[PDB]
Design a protein around this ligand. Structure first.
Ligand SMILES: [Fe+3]
Ligand SMILES: [Fe+3]
Length: 157
């Protein structure tokens, strides 16, 4: 699809960049060290806050509009369980004090992140492969250009 009407590709480039970044940080983190541990969780909190913003922008500026026009999207836009990811990080930052707790938490953190990323990727793929074509049908080219402008503005501060 032409770039100027593509409402998912650039934002998803950023989200994918962020996934790569936290996967790298996760692999290098020494979970036995409290400073490494906290730094990782603070980074995750920031990243997943941006994920949360991303989904919100989509709901408000894209999906909301699309659902109003198509009338055929019955479950639509998954949730990705971001609030619960954030609550997990918060518990690590607030309740984990020593090495035993850090290493037990780490096992669960890794499992939960793997699960999230396993769902996040297909979620983004569906938007690109299913929603984008639909937008092409229910909006004019110029309408989509304007939607993209708003979407980019919200994503980029
Ligand atoms: Fe989404
Ligand atoms: Fe998305």
């Amino acid at each position: 699809f032409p770039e100027e009407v593509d409402v998912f590709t650039a934002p998803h480039w950023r989200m994918k960049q962020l996934v790569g970044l936290y996967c790298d940080k996760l692999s290098k983190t020494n979970f036995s060290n409290n400073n490494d541990f906290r730094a990782l969780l603070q980074s995750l909190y920031a990243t997943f806050k941006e994920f949360k913003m991303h989904e919100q922008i989509e709901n408000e500026y894209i999906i909301g509009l699309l659902q109003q026009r198509s009338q055929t999207i019955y479950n639509v836009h998954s949730d990705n369980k971001l609030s619960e990811m954030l609550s997990l990080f918060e518990k690590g930052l607030k309740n984990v004090k020593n090495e035993y707790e850090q290493l037990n938490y780490a096992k669960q953190l890794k499992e939960r992140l793997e699960a999230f990323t396993r769902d996040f990727l297909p979620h983004m793929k569906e938007e690109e492969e299913v929603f984008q074509p639909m937008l092409m049908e229910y909006f004019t080219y110029e309408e989509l250009k304007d939607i993209k402008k708003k979407v980019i503005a919200q994503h980029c501060s």
